[PDB]
Copies of this chain bind each other. A is one copy, B any other.
Amino acid sequence: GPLGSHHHGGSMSFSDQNLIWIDLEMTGLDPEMHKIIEMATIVTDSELNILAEGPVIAIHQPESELAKMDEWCTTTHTASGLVARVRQSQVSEEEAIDQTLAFLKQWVPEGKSPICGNSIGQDRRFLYKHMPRLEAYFHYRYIDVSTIKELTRRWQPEVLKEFSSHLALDDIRESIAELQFYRKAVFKI
């Protein structure tokens, strides 16, 4: 697969092995026409203990952009309250990047943590397009919790039943809890 010449102050808990967890909410699935409307980050250590919780940011977008949400997006993000927070927000993407980067720099250096979460491949696509300065803060690797879920569904479906918002803070916290479950129930550590 991919190959390149580069691919071949803060906390007393600062570590190259800390993990950056991120979730985004968007107006749709296509980075070329859709926009980021919410972001949240959390830092754990390599053992998934939460060290710090980043800013939860609703990113302002005009109605012309909200009018691109399909029916499921519109219904979901309106009912959750996210649309109202987006309309009220005075935070641009660039300000959201600045705030998030300023947060992460106290916990892990640039380029060291994989990107972690659920549906993290799709989220990274929107980082590349709309927030490349923040995308660049991650190591090239991914920790896709959804990969573990799908293999467990296929191979150990009864185990998956043991574990039970489209708001970014809830989704990222749930992803950590879900990986914590897999570590115990699937990996058996």
Contacts and interface: CB of A to CB of B under 8 A. Distances in A.
Given A121-B144, A183-B155, A73 B3 contact: yes
Given A4-B28, A72-B5, A187 B156 contact: yes
A122 B1 contact: yes
Q: How many copies, total?
A: 2
Interface of A is mostly: mixed
A81 interface: no
A114 B144 CA distance: 13
A126 B141 CA distance: 16
A2 interface: yes
Interface string A99-137: 000000000000000100111111111001000000000
24 contacts: A1-B26, A1-B119, A1-B123, A1-B171, A2-B29, A2-B119, A2-B122, A3-B25, A3-B166, A4-B28, A4-B29, A4-B70, A4-B73, A7-B72, A8-B72, A114-B150, A121-B121, A121-B124, A125-B128, A141-B146, A141-B150, A143-B147, A143-B150, A147-B147
Interface of A: 1-5, 7-8, 17, 23-26, 28-29, 46, 70-73, 76-77, 114, 117-125, 128, 140-144, 146-148, 150-151, 154-156, 166, 171, 183, 186-189
